[PDB]
Design a protein around this nucleic acid. Sequence first.
RNA 1: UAAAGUUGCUGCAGUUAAAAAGCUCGUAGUUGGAUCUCUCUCGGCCGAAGCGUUUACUUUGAAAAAA
Lengths: 149, 213, 129, 82, 186, 82
Amino acid sequence: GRMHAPGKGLSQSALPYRRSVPTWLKLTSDDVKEQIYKLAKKGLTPSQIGVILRDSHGVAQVRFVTGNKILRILKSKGLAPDLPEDLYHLIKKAVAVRKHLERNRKDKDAKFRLILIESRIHRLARYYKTKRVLPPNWKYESSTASALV
Amino acid sequence: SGALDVLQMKEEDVLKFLAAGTHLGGTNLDFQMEQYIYKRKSDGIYIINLKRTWEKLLLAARAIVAIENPADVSVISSRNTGQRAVLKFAAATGATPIAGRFTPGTFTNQIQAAFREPRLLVVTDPRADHQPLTEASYVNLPTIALCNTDSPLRYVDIAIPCNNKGAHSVGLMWWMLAREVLRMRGTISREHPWEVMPDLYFYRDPEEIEKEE
Amino acid sequence: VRMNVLADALKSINNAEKRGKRQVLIRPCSKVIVRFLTVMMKHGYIGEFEIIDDHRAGKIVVNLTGRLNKCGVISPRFDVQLKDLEKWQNNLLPSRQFGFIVLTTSAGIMDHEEARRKHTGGKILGFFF
Amino acid sequence: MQNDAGEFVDLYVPRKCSASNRIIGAKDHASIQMNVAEVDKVTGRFNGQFKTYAICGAIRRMGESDDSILRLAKADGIVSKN
Amino acid sequence: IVKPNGEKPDEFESGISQALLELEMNSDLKAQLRELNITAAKEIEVGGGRKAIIIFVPVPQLKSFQKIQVRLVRELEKKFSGKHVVFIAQRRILPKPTRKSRTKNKQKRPRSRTLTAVHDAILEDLVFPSEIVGKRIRVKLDGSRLIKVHLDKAQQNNVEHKVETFSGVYKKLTGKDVNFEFPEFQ
Amino acid sequence: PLAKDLLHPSPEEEKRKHKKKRLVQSPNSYFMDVKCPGCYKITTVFSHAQTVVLCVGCSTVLCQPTGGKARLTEGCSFRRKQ
RNA sequence: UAAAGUUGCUGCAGUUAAAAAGCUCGUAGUUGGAUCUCUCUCGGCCGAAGCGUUUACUUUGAAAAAA
C-alpha cells in the first residue's frame, strides 16, 4: 500500500514481454537521443520526455531503442538537473503547502500533510545521499526550500 | 456415451429437447453449473448445452444400470411437476419411487416403518429435494439430480443439466432417463423408437385435466 | 511487505493442498523455491511443475499429487549443525519413518537424510511431510 | 504397513478418494463408491463390468463431487472427449 | 578474409568464407558485405542424417548481419544443399568469480557476459526472424529441465521447418533441451 | 472447479483478467497510426496518450487526453498495430 | 525444580474471560523482492609465494586442569 496513505492501489504500467523495438518505429537510436536532448533543452523532466516520446512520436520504451534510460542519456551528454526530479517535485509540493500555511494557520490538515511530505523528502534525500547522488551535507530546510525550487 | 456412434444423440432427441424447452435455463447461474451452459441470451436466460445434457444423462443411465437390483435405485420428486414422471420411471425401470413429501429419517431411522436403504438416489430438483439429498450423506448414498442453471450441487454426484422447472422438460428428462436405462439394460432396442411416448410422464394440473376431458 | 518468498510459496502449496486442488500458481519464483520444489518432487510429494518466464520474476504452476500433508518454512533460517539435526527432526517431523527437513548447505539444498549422508550441517529452510 | 521382515501388519488398507487421493475414513458416511456401467462398442449394452470411483464426503459437501466424477469419466473414455 | 579466433581456419570455415566472398563480389548484397565479417563456423548433426551449420558473427556486427540475414540465409542454403544455416553471435562467457581464485579481473564481471545471459542471447539469436513471445521451463519428475519457447504466429510456416535444428543447435552449444511452439493466442 | 488449468488458460479468460494478474502480464494499450485530411505523414499516437496531439499539417488536434483512452476527433482514421 | 504451554525460544494470550497505545508521522532497533555456472622456483604432478572482496556459516584439525 501507500507509504503515507491507507490506500492499496494496483494502478501501474504493465510492460510487454517483448523487449524489441516495435516494427512501426523507423526512428533509430540516435534520432531518439537527439529528440531527448531537444526536449530536455525545452526544460522537461525525464518523465515528461518519456511521456511525449510515447504519446506523439511513438516509442514504447526509450531503453529498448537506445539501450539506456532517459536520465542516464541526459547525464551522459550532461543535461540532467542538479537534484533528482522526484526530490525536486517533493520539495516543490512542500514549498507550496508551506506558502499556503502562512496565510492559513488554522488549516491543521495542511500542517499534517506538510509533515508527511517532509517525511517523504527526508527519506528520499537520505536514500540519495547514500548513493552519492546528493552531497553528504545536503540538507532540506524550510527557510532554504524555496531556494532549491 | 464414450464417443460411440451408437450412443450419439439423434435428431429426434434434439427435436424433443427443443419442443420441451430443456435447453432454456434460468436467469441465475450456479458457479458449479457454468461448465454445462452455452451462453446467456439478451433476456438473461442461460442456454444449456444439449451435448453436455446428453452426456450426463448417459452417465446417469450407466450409474443406474450398474445397480444390480433395480429396486435399490430410489427416485424422488417432492414437486408435483416430476411426481407422475417419477412413478412412470419406477414402473418402467423397476426403481422405488417416493412421490410427494419425503419423511425425514427415511434413510437414517432404522426403527421406522418406511425405512429404506437404496444403493442409488435420483431426484428431480436438488433445491426442492434437499431433504433426501442431505440424508444421502448419512448412508453413503450416491445421488443423481436434474439440475437447472441455479441448482446447488452439494451432495449431487451426477448433475444432469436441464430445465427442471417446466413440466414438459421434466417429463421428457425422466422419460429419456428411463429409455436410456432400458436400452443399456437390453430390454427394448435402440434401432426403432420406444413405444412409450414422452407425454405419459408430463404433469397435468387440474385445469388441464378438466379442459382435456 | 513481502519478505521470504519461500514462505509464501510453501503457504500457497499447503493451502491449495488443503483445498484439494490439482495445481497451484506460485509467484514470485526464486532459485530457492525451485530447489525446494525439486527436493519435494524427488521424494514423490509434489510432481512436475513448470516455470513461467515473465521478464521480471517467474511464476511457477505446480501440479499437486494428493500426497502432501504439510509443507512449512522455518523463519529465521537457523544454522543447524549435524549434532543438532536429530532434535530438529523430533520437533518437526511426524515420525522417523517419513517426513523431511530441507536444509541449505554449502553442498546445495537437500533434505536432512542427504545432509547426514554428505556430513554437512547448514541452515534450516523448511520441512515437508 | 510392512515390517523389516516384509510381512504386512496393517489391519486393512483404506480407500483413497479417486479425486483428491486422500484417505477415506472408516466413519466417513458421506463418502460414496459409484459404479459406472461399461458398454459394448457396437451395441451400447451393459457388459456386466463397470468402473468404480470413490468420492469422499468432503468433496461431496463442497459440491465438486459432480465435477470430479465428470473428470474421472472423461479421463477414462466413458464420457466423450469434448 | 575471415578473422578466426583459434588462429587456424578449418576447411569448412574457409568454405563458408569463400561463399561469403562470392556473395561479396557478385550478388544482390555486395554493398553491405564489405565491413561484415564472421569469426567461426561449425557443422553438426541435428537428427537422423541431417546437418546444419552455425556461423559465429562478432557481437558488434550482429545487428548489421541480422538486417540482411533473411536475404543471406537463403543464398547460403541454396549454396550448401540441404544444410540449415543459423547466425549466432560470438559471445564469450566469463566464469563466476569464486573466493578460490586469483587476480582474474580487477573489475566486476558484466551481466551481459554471464552464462544465463549468454544462453538467453544465444536462444534469441538462434531465431532471428521469429521473435520469442514466451518461455516456459518444465521440470520433469527426474529433475531435468525442458525449456519450451513460444514464437510469433506471423512466422509460423516460414520457420516451422527450421525447428528440430534450432533444438539441435541449442543442445550442441548450451546443452539444454529446448522445444519450440507457436501459441494461438497473440 | 478444483481442477482448473492454470498453465493453459483460455484467451478470453486472460483478456478478462487485470493486466497485472495475467499469467504473463501484458498492457491493454496500443499504438495507432492516425491519418488526417490536412497531412500525409505518419503520426503514431498512443491509445492512452496524456498529451494533446497536434497534426503538424493543420490546426486540427488529433486526440484529447482522457481518464482512460484518448479521445480521437471525428474524421481521423486510426489503425492499430500489435 | 518439575508439574507451569500459569513467563510460552521451542511454546501462551490480547472481540466478549486480564489485555491493541485515540490517531498518524517518525530516529535507533528488528526485518527486507527477482537476478551471477615466462601469474609461480632443482624432473614436462611438488613446499614455498596468495588481497581470492574482510565476513557470517558448515565441516575438520590443534588447544582446552583434575575431580
